[PDB]
Curated annotation (Swiss-Prot):
Gene3D superfamilies: RNA polymerase, Rpb5, N-terminal domain (3.40.1340.10), RPB5-like RNA polymerase subunit (3.90.940.20). This is DNA-directed RNA polymerases I, II, and III subunit RPABC1. Component of the RNA polymerase I (Pol I), RNA polymerase II (Pol II) and RNA polymerase III (Pol III) complexes consisting of at least 14, 12 and 17 subunits, respectively. Pfam families: RNA_pol_Rpb5_C (PF01191), RNA_pol_Rpb5_N (PF03871). Its main location: nucleus. The keyword Phosphoprotein applies.
Amino acid sequence: EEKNIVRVFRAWKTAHQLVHDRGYGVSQAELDLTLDQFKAMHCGMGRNLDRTTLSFYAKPSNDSNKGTIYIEFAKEPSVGIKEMRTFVHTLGDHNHKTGILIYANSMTPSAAKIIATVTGQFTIETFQESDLIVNITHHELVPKHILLSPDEKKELLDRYKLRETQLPRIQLADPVARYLGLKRGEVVKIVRRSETSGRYNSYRICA
DNA sequence: CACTCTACCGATAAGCAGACGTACCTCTCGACCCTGTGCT
């Protein structure tokens, strides 16, 4: 019982960090909470976690072009087509451009088909709770990934006289690509340490 | 308009087979059968 509560708290804080990293607005109070505060703000009198209140949303911080982002934790342990349609409806109602759905156990394939069905209208990204318990970008092995704006990508390609296919590649299913919400064609500048040069800048296109 | 019996395309793995293997060099030694048919 308590284990599920602490797991959902960890996933929820990780989702808040994920939102803040992508460039959306998350108040420092939200980032710097504690387990007890989460219990107070999301658990009932009987301490039973209330999955209705696990959803939140955020606004872009420095790029007003981006739409609002909406994050919801699946009420049912396994997401189905019914809940996928419900989530798409919720996204449409409030005009949320981006939507992240976090489920616990599994998600059906025909439910996944809905993501491609509405890709032209909304961008929907799915996470498993276990994929957000620990923030991977805080790992020592993970170097600093930074999304490049289209102007900076164009600058890089023109400087190296490159084609997008000639850059190193990063998979869309890459954990850090999913953490950063990378779409196909977007380039990430990765800053790394180096035994030889001290610091190194690699560039990977999402593909 | 609550149900529970079959249609579905899905995914699941399942057992399947098929596919691969250091470098360069020196030398020796062994290599079809079976039966028609003209010849004498």
